Amino acid sequence: TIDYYAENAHSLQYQEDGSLDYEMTAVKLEHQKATDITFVTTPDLLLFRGNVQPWHIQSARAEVGPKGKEVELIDDVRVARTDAKGQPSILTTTRLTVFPDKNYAQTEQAVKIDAANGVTTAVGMKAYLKDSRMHL
């Protein structure tokens, strides 16, 4: 069953030092009783201080297990880098295996970088989240 559920949640999480961990808005939060798995339909993650510059996320659906071990972004997947470069570098694929515990950028499928000036396609994603550098 579902132990706790919420509608139109706008959560905030703060870092150990005091900086914002993120700012996620979800249509509904569902936590089944069998496992500590939380469904966040239509997340809007914004790593406000994870890398100084927010990492705009417009994933259609996100699935979270007991911990952030695998918060998989199912269906529509978007990664708006919003970094010093004006290119969004939006990656869509079908899923993005973000690693909140690992804190690394990995793609479950071929990387489709939808940059502003030019669109490029790459195989695999192995790039440090903090570094924010292109890497197959």
């Binding site: 559920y5 919420a6 949640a9 959560s11 703060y14």
Partner: protein
Amino acid sequence: MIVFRYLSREVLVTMSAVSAVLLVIIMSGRFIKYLAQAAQGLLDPGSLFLIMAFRIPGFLQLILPLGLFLGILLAYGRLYLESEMTVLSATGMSQKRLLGYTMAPALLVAILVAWLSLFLAPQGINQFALLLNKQDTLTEFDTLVPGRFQAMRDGTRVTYTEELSKDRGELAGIFISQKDLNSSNQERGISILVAEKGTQNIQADGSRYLILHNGYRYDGNPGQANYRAIQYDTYGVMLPKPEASSEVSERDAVPTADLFGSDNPRYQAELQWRLSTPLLVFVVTLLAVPLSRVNPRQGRFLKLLPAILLYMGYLALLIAVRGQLDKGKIPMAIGLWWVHGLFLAIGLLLFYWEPLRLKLAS
């Protein structure tokens, strides 16, 4: 073959009487606590009868061996005081023959207790839990007073309500703080809940989905910077039953058929515990014969309280060993049987005292 029937009838009748008295006493003793809980606000008085009816077999499974102990003591004390047993012994009937005579009622009681502990206590507890998982908890959250802190489930969780409607629902500013006794990391430690109004929704299949009109959910620790602030409109968390399984662990409700083979330490410990009652009955029968020899100076009732104390200590040792074994410390190979061995040895030494002394006197 006539003394056999005579002694069997005496022992059985006395055991039945003592068992009835003990059952009444124990049922009243536990009803005391249940009535206290009902008066405190929890529980529903209409369900007490069913609870006691479904819990009776568990009481019987432990009362019966003590009933047999006391029945043997009383019957053989009567036969000793009235000189019947002196005439029986002065004619040829040894004491091993007496033990053989008294081991028939012990066998019948062991069969009965095995049937109980293996096929009626589990079903009884299962029915008790199923019929307890009902509107009782829904009443408890309706018991909230606009100014009382109901610390449900000991010190782990609390509940509050500034104002609660008489008809239920449309509560005032609600506050619910829950703490997890586990590691809890940092955020999981304390999680508070505040909703402006809050409401209770009856599940189509579940018990109740407390629906909060609007509020927040806070997680973290009082002395740390990280705090997960969640702002919502409708929030739903079910209300667990305070006594759904607190007084009845799921280990008891599992049918004895499933206990076989399972590598779960708790299940194997429970299976060892279930088989201990017939052995306890036989051990008490063995060590109740020699203790029943009383002269008229010390009467017949003198050694009943010490017998009750010995039986209670036996049960307490069995339960403590079972716990420390199901928690993994005591190896399962040795198991729970060393307590039975210890009490069998003490009873055997008590039984062979007179022959040993006679052999000592050349």
